[PDB]
Design a protein around this ligand. Sequence first.
Ligand code: LEU
Length: 290
Amino acid sequence: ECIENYAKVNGIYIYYKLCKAPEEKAKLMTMHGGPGMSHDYLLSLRDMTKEGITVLFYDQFGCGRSEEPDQSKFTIDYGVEEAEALRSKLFGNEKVFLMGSSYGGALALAYAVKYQDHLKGLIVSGGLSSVPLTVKEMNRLIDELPAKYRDAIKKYGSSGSYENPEYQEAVNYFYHQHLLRSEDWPPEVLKSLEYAERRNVYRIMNGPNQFTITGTIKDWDITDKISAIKIPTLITVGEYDEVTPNVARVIHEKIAGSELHVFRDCSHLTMWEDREGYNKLLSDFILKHL
Ligand SMILES: CC(C)C[C@H](N)C(=O)O
């Protein structure tokens, strides 16, 4: 199996899981989303170790098994310096590939903008360069929901009654439509969702749920900076993704030479809805840019 341990980054203990591939061809670092979830739901990407790709997983600050820094450090900027400090501490000067999912994709983009010189490639899945845009698109999806659920979200969401049964029902319907399409949710996914509700990062940085971003990153938007990224980039997004293909398009437009793939019949957690297809696509991309 993989090796698990604690890395002293910026003064705090960060949990990481390094799954080395037999005949290593390259290293892939991963950034889970939320913000405030855990690496757990990205474990399906371990399959790539069979493709000669070593995958590094880690729980970001205040997430999962990792320690929580001062609240003042709950920022994407800190997350970027944490990722770099971890890369440097584990791989030194070796250049690696960086993959990010949702908020992790935003974190990956922020990282690339400042440290692309340390990367060989970039992969963004269900990621975003703009929170406001993501919010606007998610609101559109909410208006496409059945009246019942649409009114429940607006009514209780405006009164801050996220605990309400009717609201919970609307959230569930939305998730099975744009988060993880009607299937059989794996333990890895449930663990990440629970970790988010238990720690404090999600509530402070993100908000109550997936489609309600009232946290501290609500105005975050680096769409005007990502265009500086000049490294091979793979952008993936689900057809029914809660972070719409429109949002993905905005990233694709700014990154020259980047590739955009829209997974049909898939949503946000594409690495579980089409595990084989997802892992194949990423490994294909990685192996062509050594
Ligand atoms: C709403 C966005 C932050 C996306 C999603 N909550 C995630 O980062 O997993």
